[PDB]
Structure formats: structure tokens, C-alpha cells
Design a protein around this nucleic acid. Structure first.
Lengths: 48, 40, 48, 49, 49
DNA sequence: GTACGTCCGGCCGTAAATTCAGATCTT
RNA sequence: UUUUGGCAUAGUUGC
DNA sequence: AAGATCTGAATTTACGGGCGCAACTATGCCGGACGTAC
């Protein structure tokens, strides 16, 4: 997202980046909530 | 009769619950109905 | 004897039906021991 | 490998979906005494469900 | 070829099928061993019913 | 030319939310 | 000349 | 008087918890891409 704003990229991809960043921080503090699916570590195991 | 006791009842007493398993009223009588089975 | 009144003493030994009903009776002792251990500490830790 | 893993770990179902897989079906055989081996081989497990 | 299937010991396709106790001793296999388990990575695995 | 092979990219208790009867306003 | 260590699981078992 | 509104009071999903510790075991996260050798 930083290089998007440095380039001045499009808005829809920036919104998708904000969406994914929101999901990543939310599952970094709390990888359990009645929202998006859980985060896995690419090894078929949820993150703590 | 059959009344809940033991650790379920102790649970409910400490875990104060709106739904007793066996709620009851040990209700007493004072007139002649206390001794008269018919009036009781 | 049909509904599980065993009439022999342990000295005399139980019959097959009597033995099976006695095993059924002792199974509840084992299970309620297990659930007592399951509730060990929980009430106590809540109280303390 | 697919059978092998499932028998090596006892997780049954899709390997990648092992989060919701039934576990403990396959167990290392208990070789402590012959009676224990026979008892383990003739064993039934009732899941909670 | 499509893969490899683990073989329960002393089944109809294990090499110890219908072998006399002498031959089991020659292969260093206990004739009283009941079988009914798989060998996965050398570990004896039994499937609980 | 061919393949390999190994180095890089993908239960129960709250608690919120939905529907029904006074009440002041509106008419 | 003074080190040492996988983490999270799943199963089994003791009181 | 009538109404519409409309604002406080009865019914449905939905997290979120779920014995002290011991002891032992056994198992675990690729496929394109690029070169080099033969």
C-alpha cells in the first residue's frame, strides 16, 4: 500500500490493500473472532 | 420428594441462576388446616 | 432378579445376570467419580 | 503418502482439512505385555459427537 | 502403478500368511504374535474400531 | 537433446435486533 | 578456556 | 373521532466458557525455473 501511494496507484486496489491489512492486524492481535476465516501459517495450522 | 442436592445444587447457589431444577415452596399453615388433613 | 436384585453374597459368587447387573451398578460409581474429578477445583477456584 | 500419513498420525479425512478431522483412530500398538497387545487389538472407540 | 498400500500383518497378502511356526521362527517372527496391525516407518500402528 | 536436480516464488447468560400497545401530536 | 535449547499439537497412562 | 406515528415492551441467533497435575509416546510445512553437466 505504501508503494501504491508513492506511485499514486488506483483506488480499488488500495481499498483491497486496506481490507487485507485490516484482516492481518485483527488476526495478529486476535486470531479468533466471528468474522473472516482464521489465519493459517501456510502449514495447515492456525496462528497463535 | 426428589430435590436437587450435591454439587449441582451448590453450583446453582454460587452460580445464581434464574432457572432452578427443582424450585419449591415449603409453605406452612397456621389455622386448623395445619392439623386438619381435609382443610389442608 | 429380572430387574437387577442380586441375591448371592460375594462369598457365594454372583450368577451371570447378577454379575452383569453388578457391573452396570459399579459403572455409575466410576462415572460419577470421573465427573466429580471433572468438577474438582472449578467451584473451589471460583470461590477463592 | 496419503494413507501413510493418516496411519502415521491417526488424523482421518483430508490432510489439509485436518482441523476438522477425527483424530486418534490409529494408535501405536501397546507392546508392554501380551494381554495388553490383545486388548489393544480388540478395542472400540466411541467418539463424543 | 498408482501407489503403495500398507498391509496388515498376517492378512491374506502379508508374507506371513499361512506360514507354519517354524518358518515364522526362521524369519524371526513370533508365532504367538496375533498380527492385525500395520508397520508405518517401523512403528506398529493399530486402527481402533 | 534430455533429464535431473536443486535453487527461488506462492448448556445459559447476556446481548443485539425485530414487532406490538399508550400517547402525544396531528388532523 | 564451563555449556544445555525446537515451539504447538494429537494419543495413551498414574493419582 | 380517526389516524399515523411512534416509542417502550415480548420473542430469536450467537459468543464463550468446559479438574489438579504428573508420566510416556509419536508426528509434523511444494512447484516452476534456471543452469549445468553430460
Amino acid at each position: 500500500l505504501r508503494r501504491n501511494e508513492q506511485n499514486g496507484a488506483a483506488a480499488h486496489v488500495i481499498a483491497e490493500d486496506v481490507k487485507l491489512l485490516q484482516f492481518h492486524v485483527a488476526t495478529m492481535v486476535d486470531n479468533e473472532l466471528p468474522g473472516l476465516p482464521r489465519a493459517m501459517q501456510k502449514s495447515g495450522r492456525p496462528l497463535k | 420428594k426428589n430435590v436437587t442436592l450435591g454439587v449441582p445444587r451448590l453450583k446453582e447457589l454460587i452460580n445464581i441462576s434464574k432457572k432452578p431444577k427443582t424450585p419449591s415452596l415449603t409453605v406452612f399453615l397456621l389455622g386448623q388446616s395445619a392439623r386438619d388433613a381435609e382443610r389442608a | 432378579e429380572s430387574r437387577g436384585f442380586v441375591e448371592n453374597s460375594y462369598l457365594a459368587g454372583l450368577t451371570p445376570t447378577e454379575f452383569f447387573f453388578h457391573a452396570m451398578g459399579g459403572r455409575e460409581g466410576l462415572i460419577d467419580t470421573a465427573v466429580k474429578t471433572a468438577e474438582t477445583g472449578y467451584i473451589q477456584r471460583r470461590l477463592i | 503418502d496419503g494413507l501413510k500419513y493418516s496411519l502415521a498420525t491417526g488424523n482421518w479425512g483430508d490432510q489439509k482439512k485436518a482441523h476438522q478431522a477425527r483424530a486418534g483412530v490409529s494408535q501405536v500398538l501397546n507392546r508392554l505385555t501380551f494381554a495388553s497387545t490383545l486388548s489393544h487389538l480388540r478395542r472400540l472407540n466411541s467418539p463424543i459427537g | 502403478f498408482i501407489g503403495k498400500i500398507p498391509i496388515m500383518l498376517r492378512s491374506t497378502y502379508c508374507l506371513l500368511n499361512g506360514l507354519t511356526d517354524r518358518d515364522l521362527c526362521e524369519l524371526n517372527e513370533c508365532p504367538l504374535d496375533p498380527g492385525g496391525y500395520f508397520i508405518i516407518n517401523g512403528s506398529e500402528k493399530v486402527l481402533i474400531a
